[model samples]
Target: STGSATTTPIDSLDDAYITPVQIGTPAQTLNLDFDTGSSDLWVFSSETTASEVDGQTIYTPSKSTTAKLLSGATWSISYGDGSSSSGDVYTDTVSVGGLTVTGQAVESAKKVSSSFTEDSTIDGLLGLAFSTLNTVSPTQQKTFFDNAKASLDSPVFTADLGYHAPGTYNFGFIDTTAYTGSITYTAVSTKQGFWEWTSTGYAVGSGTFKSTSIDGIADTGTTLLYLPATVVSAYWAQVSGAKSSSSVGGYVFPCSATLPSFTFGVGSARIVIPGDYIDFGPISTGSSSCFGGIQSSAGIGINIFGDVALKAAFVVFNGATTPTLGFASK
Candidate 1:
């Protein structure tokens, strides 16, 4: 059945959002990060070392009569931020909201990096990307959306990420009431297993829009908006006290600095990011300096329209014959 789920930002780290998901027979509910950037459904499990478990909940497949091991299949994944998880595989029932998928591949983590172990709230990740990006070896697995799409009225999902607030992730349908204005559509190239597209260009504040082409992916898991170094420098230069600080990492500015809005081209539509959204709070508790939410994508090769940018618009991930993205003012 078609359904939707609510995603709420973590209190300690407002960068990512988590949704409740039930796994296995008799279902163990866990708070999972719905990530569109990667494809691999993994969870902290009884298989994980106690030392790494910390305060996170663990999935126990052995306790579920419906759980079955996938023989020797295993998965190892490393995120762009250097966080990683590795584990064996099991077939189980996974459900989100009112939708349920039977015989879903659920990776049980035996090891997790500090990035995950330290985040006590996130029990696992629910991958929403294409199944081709699944990390399970020998036999790749389909994502929950992929397995559930055929039964859905439409093969689509919408991400309405909010600014430090609860948002909705609707599956199988789009709620027109959630967005305003006409939705601007763009062709997506999923060759890299990501919702990737090229932007016509961008502009700092209300300045003239540059015509440079930028290739990037729409990543729900990434916290910040990453653009070319030249573009980041141009935007930061407009701020009087903005500077690139090695100590602070990326660009930092005085908390009281007057910031300007950053606008980017999405096909013919122009989405503007507010200046307040760019100021990502203070770097330290007592420090008067704040880190910018938009940074350079120098070492990453491709730019990223992370939460910082996505929250400014209503997005549609269409899984039709040729994947497409629809954007609108929220």
Candidate 2:
């Protein structure tokens, strides 16, 4: 039987983590970061002998009984951070949580850079956020969700962002344990599975400046909510004593008490970010502080609802019935 792909919030108690399906029965553990920025699932391998690759979570094929590599199909990806990697194609019986899918497409890196290799906890990225965006096509391509939709008990996949705590990621069937209410739904664009925005205007705080809202995209891989600069500053101005510390690239508040809760409304969706996520971290040791969740990306043409805000609600990606997203609370 093909595996299932259901969207649910990562339980916050477990650090809001993403689980990757390993190849074959009695699968080994392969926890991943579910990313939406790009459509590629990449994992570090024990065979990658490059010195530049640091701290990456490497997968051991010997530990599994069904790992198989595709003959000539190679893969490579370049991040916005200027880091890149490439590997040969492979297929295996992948399993996530308790669900298993056979012959899933994967790439084995022959080389990886330090930035990708450094995160020991980051075993790999499972890019199920988009179907067409997947790197493998036709003969050897299938998404976790693509196969999962066939037999899910429910005709929906939901995600609860803040189900446990802040910054944790979770996924699975929308846990009925969280919320039991009517779901609010938004249709998904067939061209790309990521969330899209129609507005180009937004207000941070109660500020008067009309900030431009470009096409907004929902990305699970991204860590911060990137917005246009002037609007970001305008929103920061509303926070009591909010200022840019010399420490980080964004605004910061001297005291958490000075920060205010910010709300964003997009295409019938209203999201509120708490002060703790907005004013928690430092920009620099002696410099000012950085906004816990918001950041500036002058070159990023598209606005992004990254993990910072996505972790708070139970979000659903309804690929089975209609191309849409349903949001709720648990």
Model 2 reaches what TM-score against the true structure?
0.80
Model 2 lDDT, residue 49, Cα: 70
TM of each candidate vs. truth: 0.97, 0.80
Question: Candidates' lDDT values, in order?
Answer: 0.90, 0.59
Per TM-score, the best of the predicted structures is 1
Total clashing residue pairs per candidate? 0, 32
Per-residue lDDT for 1-330 in model 1, tens only?
577889999864467899999898798999999998999999999999889998888899998889999999999999988999999999999888888889999999999999899999999999988889999998999998898889888989899988878998988898999988988888899899999988889999989999888899999989899999999999999998899998878999999997899998898898888887787888988889989989999999889999888988999999988899988888
lDDT for 91 (candidate 2): 73
lDDT of 2 by residue, 87-127 (tens): 77677776665565567776667777776676556667777
Worst 10 residues of 1 by lDDT: 9-18
Relative to the unseen true structure, what is the Cα RMSD of model 1? Answer: 1.2
For candidate 2, the per-residue lDDT at 297 reads 56
lDDT of residue 17 for candidate 1:
91
